[PDB]
């Protein structure tokens, strides 16, 4: 852990948290636990709450990994973002082969309700629907869209709201980092339409997996995402190829500039454990020491 906590500092600036993605396999090895305890105030399960992990076989749930994280988080005072309920990746084949609307609808509702009720009152926010958009702004043609139709999104959120009224319900996606981007404009428009129709969408999560130099665009993109009217917006899976302080500070400033931006979650602790380790995109290096970008953020928040 670094001596200064970016979570405490961002809280002093009026935000809710500065967190990281993690899970049992990380918490039990290296210095991950210590770093997370001292420097962050929120955790997102990297994989333990995904469909393949929680319901590998229909109706046969596995919460071992998810329980470890939730209990560890409560004990250590860290907020939790549930991730993720409806998604086309890491989806068991028993789900993807269903072609009946009723069957899939009930399977989806049961998956959502079961996970959310088990952790009712302990989860700050849930990424209810993940990566539902194609790059041109149209809806991704996943099994849920193909079998259930566009209504799958309203249904997912209505169900989540009923399962745990206390949780902030998010629609999450990537490539919403530029204001001119087709996808960015599309999600703002659809979320407005959905909210006008009464769909309980509390927030828009922007994954923010960036390439070097892209940080500047987020300064314009985030205020645009905020214009959709959701109570909150959040940077959910931040990592930047090269981890340049310039990009990292830009993303942080974008959040401080947007009132509704509640916080930031970086996707992992140390570089070698990143899903894109070769681009060393995180805040701590392979030896678990904070990188220049971590210090740049602390100074900026000072």
UniProtKB/Swiss-Prot annotation:
Domain of life of the organism encoding this protein: Eukaryota
Catalytic site: 131 (proton donor), 237 (nucleophile)
Reactions catalysed according to its record: Endohydrolysis of (1->4)-beta-D-xylosidic linkages in xylans
One Gene Ontology term from the biological process aspect of the record: xylan catabolic process
EC number: 3.2.1.8
Organism lineage string: Eukaryota, Fungi, Dikarya, Ascomycota, Pezizomycotina
Domain GH10: 3-300
Family: Belongs to the glycosyl hydrolase 10 (cellulase F) family.
Name recorded for this polypeptide: Endo-1,4-beta-xylanase
Pfam families for the chain: Glyco_hydro_10
GO molecular function annotation: endo-1,4-beta-xylanase activity
Keywords annotated in UniProt: Carbohydrate metabolism, Disulfide bond, Glycosidase, Hydrolase, Polysaccharide degradation, Pyrrolidone carboxylic acid, Signal, Xylan degradation
Keyword Disulfide bond (UniProt): yes
Source species of the chain: Thermoascus aurantiacus
InterPro entries: GH10, GH10_AS, GH10_dom, Glycoside_hydrolase_SF
Bridged cysteine pairs (disulfide): 255-261
Residues with Pyrrolidone carboxylic acid modification: 1
């Amino acid at each position: 852990q670094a001596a200064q906590s970016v979570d405490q500092l961002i809280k002093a600036r009026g935000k809710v948290y500065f967190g990281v993605a993690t899970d049992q396999n990380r918490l039990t090895t290296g210095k991950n636990a210590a770093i997370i305890q001292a420097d962050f105030g929120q955790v997102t399960p990297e994989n333990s709450m995904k469909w393949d992990a929680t319901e590998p076989s229909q109706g046969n749930f596995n919460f071992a990994g998810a329980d470890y994280l939730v209990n560890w988080a409560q004990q250590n005072g860290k907020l939790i973002r549930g991730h993720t309920l409806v998604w086309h990746s890491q989806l068991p084949s028993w789900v993807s082969s269903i072609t009946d609307k009723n069957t899939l609808t009930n399977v989806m509702k049961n998956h959502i309700t079961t996970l959310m009720t088990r952790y009712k009152g302990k989860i700050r926010a849930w990424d209810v629907v993940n990566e539902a958009f194609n790059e041109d702004g149209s809806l991704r043609q996943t099994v849920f869209l193909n079998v259930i139709g566009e209504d799958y999104i309203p249904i997912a959120f209505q169900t989540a709201r009923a399962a745990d009224p206390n949780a902030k319900l998010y629609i999450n996606d990537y490539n919403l980092d530029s204001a001119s981007y087709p996808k960015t404009q599309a999600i703002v428009n659809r979320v407005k339409q959905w909210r006008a129709a009464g769909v309980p969408i509390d927030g828009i999560g922007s994954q923010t997996h960036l390439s070097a130099g892209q940080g500047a665009g987020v300064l314009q993109a985030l205020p645009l995402l905020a214009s959709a009217g959701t109570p909150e917006v959040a940077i959910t899976e931040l990592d930047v190829a090269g981890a340049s302080p310039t990009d990292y500070v830009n993303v942080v400033n974008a959040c401080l500039n947007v009132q509704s931006c509640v916080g930031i979650t970086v996707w992992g602790v140390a570089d070698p454990d990143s899903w894109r380790a070769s681009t060393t995109p995180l805040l701590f290096d392979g030896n678990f020491n904070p990188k220049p970008a971590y210090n740049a953020i602390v100074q900026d928040l000072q």
